[PDB]
Subunit: 395 residues, 5 copies
């Protein structure tokens, strides 16, 4: 028997090992597969249709009972590499998968004596995760990965873990911290999945916690919003000169409204979408629009000869609002006296025109008070969100 | 015969089972496959080209007659797992499929004694469904899934059901209610599909009813439309000051017209597309445009020296419209008397200019009445649609 | 021989049938394949790069001569199902294909006695068709599908038809009439394709006629164009008040020019692209632009002190254009007489200013006549196109 | 031996023909493969990342020496069809390939007596070609296709040609002239590719010449540019009325600037991108912008009380520029004499205001001369490019 | 033994060579694979999600010990081509891979006497690289390619290099210099990758250095920015005529703001994105916006009757700012004397109105000084970046 050790061991082991039979000697005992998953990177988190792209490394060992050999005979060999198509491989397939594939297959597997069979493989998974667009700048996502056997039951395949849960929870020795997402926790759990009154199935759920790094996003979205909160600072105190005022706003109401389009284009729009900023930015504009509507109505009322409607209706309006906020010489002298009346009529109009500019100069201050309350509330909401974002990582 | 039970059973059963033969002993009796489908999630409903993406779980059992064995001999075994490439698998393929695939294959199947053969598999299907864009905010879609054998006839393969129709109709124990679509009914039906005068085929149609969750869509599309229905409230009562009016509209007619582009971009445009809102929003603008055209024509007519055309033609126009809506001192006194005529001519023009501002102040009220009728009709249509949406789920 | 009939027939037939040999007994006679195609739906017609997506059903029968058996022996069997990888399958591949695939393979085929071999399969084809963008609203496309053997010649494989051409021409019993395209005719033809002076090849061409359903497209593109043809109705008769006129157009020349962008975005742009509407809509704007240029030049000429250039050059211009369209008291009286000259000079300017507003009021009518001729021609062209569209289906 | 001729020939030939051995009897002589390529269509020419999509037909013959038979024995057979997986196929793979595939495989090949082995197959190739965006409207592209054996050397596989180069150069009998590209020349060449000092490899390069059909592109891009070159014709001769002028340009500087966005969107943007039109259209606007800046500065200088700076600095500026272009009655008469001075002061301002409007009326003519020189140069460049485009096809 | 040499050698060698066994005779010695990589082109560098597309050529040799033969016997043969599926191929797979594939497989490999086994193959790789958007116009990217065995350890497979590192570092004999990226260095390194306390793995890292060719990008982005830095040159010295000024800016603040959208669209936006230009262009606009806000506030203060607030508060404001920058005849004469007071009142207002236009004419110069400092800093930053870009290639 002048043959190499590896060739003689491969000939002896795979001579009659038929694939298809669950490898076990008594059908009573189930076979156990133990798994391990380590994260490498996060490629894409698309919020339009709840798609998460992940890359992981993997490892699965299962005891075997038709590949036992004594190392004393075959020249002290203790580990062999065999093709993956010549033995039995369990159908451990992850759930919540969309277009699974895009990952090569490893054509070799290890085997030890007694049946310790190991396998290493990469998985590039496109999964379905319920992403919450709420708290957009500082979101904390909680995604799930479900490993189970698609066919076998609890009394056929049981899934345990290689290493303990703790050492699995904190594992960032391979992950690259260059993307826009950062790992927090990979928590494993095991339970049983039964739907009808007949079959019992194993199940292992990995909960993956991710945070978003928002420093760069903030400086490109918030800073322009805080800088554009000087428009109220600019247009202030000009009811008589509301021609210039209206000028100002008629162009400002479009200057940021034109890029509101590109802002909404840059938002990862979600059908179930209600961001805190995306509703404050809307009511901010609504309030500004109604303020300008009130100012235009006031200047239209006071610009004409209406004289703020001196009928007692405006008294009632003011009262309700206050409750709410709780022979030749004959011709000579004739011509002399004729023009004095016209001059007096010309001169009398100035005070009458200028006496009706107080209502706008009063109500603009209340509108500005409402605006300051709104921006203070917005800042408080932003501060407490950032506080929640910072305190989310203490656990 | 010192061999394991599973290996000896696999050797005995698959020794001479040739694949290809329909498994039956008398060609007269047909084989029956029974199916079951459970929904998991809805990934995409693209209305541009009638594409529906669905994920389901599946289950198919077929009686077999060359895999019968007695459990008394082979150590009380009652269920075995065998490779899927060593036996006969029916070609149950769903119709209305586009780019079917993207789903793994399960390499194992169960077998019981007597021939009970089972199979579990996931299907990710991209189907063609006739989606109705009408009733966009609150649509109720009715899609169809057709299972049949692509080759075999009614006397070769018959498709029945595992569980009864009722228990199949109400099955939401696995479905995730996080997307923008919500399951209502999965109704199964069975019939025969024959086109020529020769072949008879089995057919099972699953009708799937889906609704759209429109709360988030409403607050992002309707609320701005209701808020922008204050433009008529702002521009009111100013025929003499139609310079400011025209100012107002010339900018409002673009302020929402510029984002009408992004609105139309966000609509899932369909060739066969006529949404109730998408036609009301158009006639709303048309009516506003023609109202502004009438006001501009009126102010152009009354601004010049035409004096609303005092010829009797305007009497006829008003009548038809009413039917429609059913030595030195000599020079001294001379110079004194010369300027009085010029002053009188200057002063007489004011009343003549101000006496022709009534026609616009009358017709704007009728235009506003038409506008109020339009918005009331729009609100009534929205209310009855929401009522239909709410009452669609009582069945 | 206590064996089932099907297993014994499969063992007898496929025992020595080697695949690869054209199934025939004398190499002289060629084998004939007969095909049949039925349309299901049209998924996409992309005009950017001449891509047509179609789904069809299929059917091909070929006589066989190594699978003959007598039904008297094998228990009165007359039809058998055999795997598709164990027999000879012709390489009938369609031409004009791009990324062909995306369609499953049927693993079974029928066989009768004497050699009648049948096969059913679906084909999802992405073909290259020369689409004419001309007559965009109402196009009638004529696409081609070419079936031939990629390798074999006329004396090896001949392609005939299952059913007659007539019954093939009118076949809409399966087609779904929910899309934007509607079937008209599926005409089959057979001929020979030879390019060099040596090989002769069979060829079957199916001509497919499709029409577009333009009702929904019309109401979304034409109706706004007809509604926006009121701009000339609005801006009419105002040469002295050309400040307001210029106001009007300077904003109208952008109001539809801003969404012209989105219009051109919505057009399926084709390199070889010259739609009748897409050239009329351009010359429509050109004519309007040159009309406004003429009006602005006229008002600039008449606004200043040029007084329409009273030099005899304008006489020549008008003639050529007409051819084209075929001690104290001393100071007292002094001061009295000094101001009368200034008053007369002030009063004399009004008639001189108002006497030069006729040329624009004359040429605007000619410009409007040209505009009415243009819109009448546009309406006539639209009417005759729709007439061609309606009369295209009488055949 | 009562067997069919084809079955007996297939049994005799493929009985012991092992695949893998280069088919030759003396390892010294190399085997020669002869190829032929015929073009069908051009699907896509993407200039963003240098991707060319092509479809071709193909043909390759190689002498064989283990499939020789005498036609006298096997019933006068001279041509046989054999599966492509049972014989030796050379690894002739094209270089410069990206995502090669998307094309079916032909499962049969011809064989003659003596070893003449033929093969026909379609190839759909996505190649990398250096496309020059320069001369965009009328480009002449020169792409390369490189056929070589990926493994074998010059003394193992040599690649010659089926037909001569001339008959290969002019081959448009199958090509469809409906796209935006038109074939000019398919020139074959053969040489040797060696990089190190050890291996020698065969290489066949097909140079493919393509032109663009620009008639439709011209009418959609140039005609609007020539039509919009009337803006200088419109705004001419109005320094005093520069309010209307500034009005005009402030809106024209945006009227085409707003669709400049969509123009740049429609350009196939290339990183290495410098089109002749794309630089002329930019300098055209730059020149117009600086002209308007000069006019606005001039009108701002002459509008105020600066009076074109009558200090001798403007003399130096003009000189340098010219070098560059090479008791009661007492009160009565008092009041009479008081107002005459005010009237004279009022009347004297008109000539002083009107005497400073010449500098703009002089410099605008020079600016227009520069503009005319620019447009004449642009037209000359366009004419000579079209001349180059027309003369490129004379070869 | 009248057989060809190649057929007899193939029969002798592959007669009993079982695949799967690592080819070695004593399990103690490991097998060594030596690799070589040569770059061809760079197809895509997408900065949105860190994707790098590369094309390389490859070469791997491994000693074999079951394919030794003596050339004396088998007719002086020294090199043979054998199928790649009949021997042992190591699983050398690159790390950092996304959707690896898209590249054909070579079905043949070389073998020499003694076991020298060679293989050539192309790889089209989509890898994940951390691209730095900082220094956008002139970036120097440093990407990594990691070759290792996915399964085998250091004592099973060791990876060395064919040629030395130097000759590998400088290799541009095949690379095409037509794209937007240019090769600088391909540096190889070898080390060991161990994560736990048990397994030791080989690892070869190729560092690839790429630069961007920014000439064409510069002329399309910078030149417009330098040309648009004349807006401050145009609007200068006009506090009284701030109506025209405000006119100017209200349109300039939108003229480039409208294409800022398309600028941001053309930027390859990265979540971690902070380009030097992209922050200078923002603060440039911020500074201009606040300058215009100050000017509008100043002109609003000085336009009304406030008279720059002559209360001593403005003295304190100026001081703090300076610290910061460190019977008939009776009626006759009566009427004569009445109008003189009105004339004096009319004439006195001019000097009072004109005496308050100095503060804006002073502060605009300081604002322009800040603007000049900003643009000088921007130019200095651009110059030093280009200097870094030029000096990066000296190594
Ligand atoms: O799809 C099903 C399924 C499909 C159709 C009808 C059904 N009735 N009851 C079940 C079921 C539960 C079994 N399953 C799978 C559930 C999990 C766990 C293990 N395995 C894969 C995923 C099995
Ligand atoms: O990739 C290589 C190659 C790869 C790595 C190191 C190398 N050093 N020297 C070469 C080389 C030249 C050989 N080739 C191919 C070149 C052409 C011609 C034939 N064949 C395919 C394409 C072989
Ligand atoms: O994925 C793993 C891996 C997966 C799961 C748990 C693990 N614990 N420890 C390791 C590991 C290290 C081994 N690897 C691979 C690491 C590199 C080097 C060689 N090979 C491929 C890539 C092996």
């Amino acid at each position: 028997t002048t043959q190499p050790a590896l060739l003689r061991l491969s000939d002896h082991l795979l001579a009659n090992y038929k694939k298809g039979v669950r490898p076990v000697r008594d059908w009573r005992k189930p076979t156990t597969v133990s798994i391990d998953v380590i994260m490498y990177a996060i490629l894409n988190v698309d919020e339009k249709n709840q798609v998460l792209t992940t890359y992981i490394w993997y490892r699965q060992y299962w005891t075997d009972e038709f590949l036992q050999w004594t190392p004393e005979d075959f020249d002290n060999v203790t580990k062999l590499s065999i093709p993956t198509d010549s033995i039995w491989v369990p159908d451990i397939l992850i759930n919540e998968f969309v277009d699974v594939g895009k990952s090569p297959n490893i054509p070799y597997v290890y085997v030890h004596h007694r049946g310790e069979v190991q396998n290493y493989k990469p998985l590039q998974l496109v999964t379905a995760c319920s992403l919450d667009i709420y708290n957009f700048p500082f979101d904390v996502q909680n995604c799930s990965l479900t490993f189970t056997s698609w066919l076998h039951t609890i009394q056929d395949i049981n899934i345990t873990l290689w290493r303990s849960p703790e050492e699995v929870r904190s594992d960032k020795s391979i992950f690259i911290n260059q993307g826009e997402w950062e790992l927090l926790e990979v928590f494993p759990q095991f339970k049983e999945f039964s739907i009808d009154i007949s079959n019992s199935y194993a199940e292992m759920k990995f909960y993956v916690i991710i945070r978003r790094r928002p420093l760069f996003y903030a400086v490109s979205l918030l800073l322009p919003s805080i800088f554009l909160m000087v428009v109220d600072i600019v247009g202030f105190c000009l009811p008589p000169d509301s021609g210039e005022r209206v000028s100002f706003k008629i162009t400002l109401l479009l200057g940021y409204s034109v890029f509101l389009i590109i802002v909404s284009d840059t938002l990862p729009a979600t059908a179930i979408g209600t961001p805190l900023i995306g509703v404050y930015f809307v009511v901010c504009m609504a309030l500004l629009v109604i303020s300008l509507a009130e100012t235009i109505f006031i200047v239209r009322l006071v610009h004409k000869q209406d004289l703020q409607r001196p009928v007692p209706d405006w008294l009632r309006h003011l009262v309700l609002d206050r409750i709410a906020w709780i022979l030749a010489v004959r011709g000579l002298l004739q011509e002399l006296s004729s023009i004095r009346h016209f001059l007096e009529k010309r001169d009398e109009m100035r005070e009458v025109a200028r006496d009706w500019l107080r209502v706008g100069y009063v109500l603009d201050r209340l509108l500005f008070r409402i605006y300051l309350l709104a921006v203070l509330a917005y800042s408080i909401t932003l501060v407490t969100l950032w506080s929640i974002w910072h305190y989310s990582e203490n656990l």
